[PDB]
Amino acid sequence: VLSPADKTNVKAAWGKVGAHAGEYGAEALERMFLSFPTTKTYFPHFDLSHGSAQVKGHGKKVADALTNAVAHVDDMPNALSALSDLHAHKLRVDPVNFKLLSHCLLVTLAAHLPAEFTPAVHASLDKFLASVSTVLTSKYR
Amino acid sequence: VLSPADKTNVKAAWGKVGAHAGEYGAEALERMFLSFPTTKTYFPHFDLSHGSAQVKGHGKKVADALTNAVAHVDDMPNALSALSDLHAHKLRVDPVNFKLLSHCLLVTLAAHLPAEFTPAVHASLDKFLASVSTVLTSKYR
Amino acid sequence: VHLTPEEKSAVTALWGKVNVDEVGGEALGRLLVVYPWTQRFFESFGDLSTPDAVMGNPKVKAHGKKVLGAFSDGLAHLDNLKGTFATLSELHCDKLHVDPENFRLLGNVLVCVLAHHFGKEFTPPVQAAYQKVVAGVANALAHKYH
Amino acid sequence: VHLTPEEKSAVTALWGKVNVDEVGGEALGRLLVVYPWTQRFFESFGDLSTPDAVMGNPKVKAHGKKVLGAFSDGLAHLDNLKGTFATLSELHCDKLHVDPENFRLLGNVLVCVLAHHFGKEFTPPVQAAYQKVVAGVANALAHKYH
Numbered sequence: 001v002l003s004p005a006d007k008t009n010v011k012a013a014w015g016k017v018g019a020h021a022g023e024y025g026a027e028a029l030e031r032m033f034l035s036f037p038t039t040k041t042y043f044p045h046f047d048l049s050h051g052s053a054q055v056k057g058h059g060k061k062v063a064d065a066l067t068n069a070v071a072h073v074d075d076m077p078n079a080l081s082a083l084s085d086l087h088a089h090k091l092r093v094d095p096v097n098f099k100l101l102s103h104c105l106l107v108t109l110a111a112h113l114p115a116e117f118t119p120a121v122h123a124s125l126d127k128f129l130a131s132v133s134t135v136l137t138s139k140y141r
Numbered sequence: 142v143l144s145p146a147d148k149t150n151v152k153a154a155w156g157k158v159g160a161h162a163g164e165y166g167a168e169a170l171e172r173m174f175l176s177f178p179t180t181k182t183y184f185p186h187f188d189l190s191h192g193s194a195q196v197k198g199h200g201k202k203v204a205d206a207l208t209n210a211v212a213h214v215d216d217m218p219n220a221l222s223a224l225s226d227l228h229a230h231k232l233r234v235d236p237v238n239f240k241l242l243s244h245c246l247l248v249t250l251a252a253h254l255p256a257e258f259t260p261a262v263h264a265s266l267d268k269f270l271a272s273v274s275t276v277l278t279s280k281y282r
Numbered sequence: 283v284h285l286t287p288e289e290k291s292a293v294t295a296l297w298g299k300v301n302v303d304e305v306g307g308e309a310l311g312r313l314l315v316v317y318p319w320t321q322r323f324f325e326s327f328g329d330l331s332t333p334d335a336v337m338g339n340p341k342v343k344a345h346g347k348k349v350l351g352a353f354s355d356g357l358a359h360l361d362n363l364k365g366t367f368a369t370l371s372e373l374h375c376d377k378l379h380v381d382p383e384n385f386r387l388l389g390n391v392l393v394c395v396l397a398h399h400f401g402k403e404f405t406p407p408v409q410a411a412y413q414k415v416v417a418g419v420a421n422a423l424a425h426k427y428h
Numbered sequence: 429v430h431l432t433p434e435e436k437s438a439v440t441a442l443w444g445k446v447n448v449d450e451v452g453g454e455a456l457g458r459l460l461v462v463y464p465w466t467q468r469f470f471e472s473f474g475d476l477s478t479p480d481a482v483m484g485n486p487k488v489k490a491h492g493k494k495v496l497g498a499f500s501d502g503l504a505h506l507d508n509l510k511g512t513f514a515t516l517s518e519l520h521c522d523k524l525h526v527d528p529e530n531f532r533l534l535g536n537v538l539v540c541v542l543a544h545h546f547g548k549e550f551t552p553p554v555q556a557a558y559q560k561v562v563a564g565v566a567n568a569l570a571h572k573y574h
């Protein structure tokens with residue numbers, strides 16, 4: 001589980017993302033599509049090319065969800081329950097895919113937060129992202 | 142999450158294993174050692190050879206532990222709190238290996254309970270071991 | 283994959299006693315019940331609700347004999363799995379958009395299913411050899427993704 | 429591992445301007461901070477109770493330097509990874525008893541470090557190439573486990 005410190009470092013790192021959340025999510029995704037091609041299968045109806053408005057769009061959707069989660073860091077199960085139902089029942093994304101996108105969020109994040117991405121914060125974000133995935137995966141079966 | 146239907150399926154099948162926990166648990170370890178060589182790195186101090194008394198004994202401790210877990214399917218974090226600390230703070234077994242041992246328990250079970258291992262019980266047992274891993278891995282960080 | 287000659291024999295010997303019509307459909311069936319999120323590539327097949335709706339569905343069972351069929355060609359050309367499924371890889375990715383990860387799940391469900399089917403005959407050494415086959419097979423069915 | 433001409437170029441061009449003394453202790457340190465269980469093989473290096481302890485721990489800063497040195501050594505031989513690491517693979521298995529799963533963890537922390545260090549220059553395409561490499565090096569290292 002997270003800790004009083006994980007939570008603060010999380011709120012800390014995210015407050016620094018600020019208004020970039022949208023372009024970081026898009027980047028996060030781009031990195032995921034190029035690094036782990038198999039993930040593309042879920043986005044057949046997307047133009048996965050660089051700069052694409054769709055990725056830029058979804059990425060913002062994804063970042064907003066996270067921003068929401070950061071602020072409900074002490075109550076995620078219910079703060080993202082709708083999203084946990086969406087990915088489990090309608091989309092049905094294989095779970096192994098969440099660890100792939102989490103790894104890219106971290107990368108995108110490390111590439112934009114030079115002074116804040118410290119060994120402790122990096123440890124905090126990883127646990128945070130693992131928890132988000134755990135929630136979004138809880139309704140799978 | 143484990144439902145009252147899954148619990149019934151577990152309780153059921155497990156009860157069917159009955160006086161074989163020892164034999165079955167040890168077989169499962171053996172299937173693991175042979176099918177996943179990398180898992181041996183954790184028992185260098187053993188004689189993983191066939192029939193090995195250290196495997197029979199250990200297989201049996203892994204066995205009883207699942208029995209205790211089945212007997213407290215409503216309060217596993219507590220029932221297993223002990224093993225959680227050992228594996229996390231002492232052994233430090235990389236999380237990936239729990240899914241590997243779980244898979245071998247499943248074929249071990251599947252090979253001894255033809256009539257019981259129905260698609261439904263199967264589905265339930267998997268979810269079950271999944272949760273025992275989740276509880277045994279939660280004390281890592 | 284690369285199995286010792288003894289592993290080769292075990293897998294062939296045991297595979298010869300398999301009933302394509304029966305095992306194939308059960309494997310796929312158990313995949314869907316145990317790993318429901320894989321049901322997305324069979325929304326057309328019909329009623330995939332409860333276990334029986336799944337196991338009973340002739341479309342799922344029908345498709346089962348096709349996978350084992352292809353699997354069979356695999357053991358025939360084990361010295362070259364990648365070329366054997368090259369075509370099936372492009373189909374599952376380009377036209378069908380299937381996450382290679384589910385091939386991994388199907389591999390394990392298959393092993394469980396053969397163990398349930400042969401019992402003690404499915405010894406630890408035999409399983410081990412089968413794990414390699416299903417692993418290689420899955421790498422092959424993924425080798426053309428891009 | 430095989431990388432396209434563009435990928436092969438990026439890897440080398442970026443690695444050419446890297447301080448192995450720096451990136452080295454940086455990676456292993458974060459490996460131990462983020463993946464606490466990996467500390468299982470370094471009780472001999474001393475205090476690993478906190479981020480800062482592990483960070484300034486000389487025993488860590490130094491060995492981290494060997495890892496990247498070997499890593500860099502393997503980059504100059506991307507055409508024969510399994511060959512350059514054979515002795516190492518055997519070492520980590522027989523003597524060190526290191527669970528190969530840990531290598532993949534070390535590969536993902538490395539990419540984070542390269543991204544944290546180079547910033548906007550660590551473009552998605554570049555990460556992609558490095559992902560293939562670290563995956564490649566990890567395979568070389570687990571190649572002789574048994």
Ligand code: HEM
Pocket residue numbers: 039042043058061062065066083087091093097098099101132133136
């Ligand atoms: C923790 C990480 C994730 C979060 C927070 C997340 C968030 C979201 C959100 C908010 C939506 C948008 C719903 C809307 O349009 O109203 C969504 C849709 C979707 N997600 Fe996720 N998701 C995550 C991980 C994944 C992963 C790993 C994949 C697979 C690679 C995935 C695939 C999709 C797909 C294909 C859709 C539907 C896209 C569409 O509307 O066309 N998601 N996700």
Ligand code: HEM
Pocket residue numbers: 180183184186202203206207224228232234238239240242273274277
């Ligand atoms: C649900 C699965 C698991 C259960 C129920 C379980 C249970 C146990 C129990 C009860 C002990 C014996 C403690 C004693 O001697 O009193 C133990 C020890 C240990 N476990 Fe696990 N374990 C599980 C999975 C794993 C996995 C996946 C690995 C590694 C691949 C592992 C590695 C170890 C090791 C090496 C020991 C110490 C052995 C020794 O005493 O020399 N365990 N486990």
Ligand code: HEM
Pocket residue numbers: 320321323324345348349352353370374378380384385388419423
């Ligand atoms: C052992 C692995 C697998 C093999 C060897 C395999 C083989 C096949 C074959 C032979 C076809 C027929 C192509 C044709 O002649 O038109 C096919 C189609 C297809 N496969 Fe697979 N498959 C495997 C795993 C999977 C998995 C895991 C899924 C997803 C859950 C999947 C989903 C499909 C779908 C949806 C089709 C098209 C079905 C239809 O609409 O008729 N396959 N597969």
Ligand code: HEM
Pocket residue numbers: 466469470472491494495496498499516520524526530531534565569
């Ligand atoms: C990129 C992968 C890695 C490379 C290239 C690598 C390379 C090396 C090298 C060259 C040495 C020193 C050999 C010697 O002087 O005897 C070594 C030793 C060792 N490695 Fe690795 N290694 C890797 C990953 C890991 C990981 C992830 C672990 C486990 C957490 C690990 C644990 C060790 C240990 C404990 C030693 C012995 C160190 C000592 O006691 O002084 N290595 N490794």
